[PDB]
Design a protein around this ligand. Structure first.
Ligand SMILES: [Cl-]
Length: 212
């Protein structure tokens, strides 16, 4: 972790985060489906890139999704060995089309759409704020350095070159700091029932690390 740069969110994204954070939803568990689907997409991208350049997998040959709850730290981590994100991807809303898609999503919500449809607008990453008060995204793309993106959805996010953290090799590790009253989402049984309900058949292994 080196020099930290602070960026403002685009107005529509701050407006959406306020809606995600301060509205009651009965189906907040859909955040996990969105992150797992995003990880599966990132894994498909590295595989596709490796079709024409096999050395793209040299940085990490094992393609998987791994979920690590940590009740002591109050965090849920979703790690994949997908294509990762460059710094430019991180700046450009974690590689999404959030510029236009958050506004479109909020217009759909005002007309009766459900929060679970957030992934149809390409901005499913922001669903992490349904259960997390802060998110730290560590990421490593073959073409760039390892970075840490962080935001507590207070109008800004930071990007820091990660020189002191464990090397990912390639991919993205999303660490969610779960809100005080939503700690059920660190429970092993809750996590497994959610993965089974919404993410039962995907193309990659989903690993859950349980500690004793
Ligand atoms: Cl703006």
């Amino acid at each position: 972790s080196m020099s930290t740069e602070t960026f403002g969110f685009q107005a529509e994204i701050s407006q959406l985060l306020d809606l995600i954070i301060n509205t009651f939803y009965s189906n907040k568990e859909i955040f996990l489906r969105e992150l797992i689907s995003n990880s599966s997409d990132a894994l498909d991208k590295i595989r596709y890139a490796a079709l024409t350049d096999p050395s793209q997998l040299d940085s990490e040959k094992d393609l998987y999704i791994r979920i690590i709850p940590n009740k002591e730290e109050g965090t849920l981590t979703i790690r994949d060995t997908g294509i990762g994100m460059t710094k430019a991807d991180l700046v450009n809303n974690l590689g999404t089309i959030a510029k236009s898609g958050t506004k479109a999503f909020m217009e759909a919500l005002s007309s009766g759409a459900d929060i679970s449809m957030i992934g149809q607008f390409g901005v499913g990453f922001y669903s992490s704020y349904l259960v997390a008060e802060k998110v730290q995204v560590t990421t490593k793309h073959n073409d760039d350095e390892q970075y840490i993106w962080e935001s507590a959805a207070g109008g800004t996010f930071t990007i820091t070159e990660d020189t002191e953290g464990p090397r990912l090799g390639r991919g993205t590790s999303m660490k969610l700091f779960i809100k005080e009253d939503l700690k059920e989402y660190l429970e092993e049984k809750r996590i497994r029932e959610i993965v089974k309900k919404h993410s039962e058949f995907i193309s990659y292994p989903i690993q859950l690390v349980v500690t004793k």
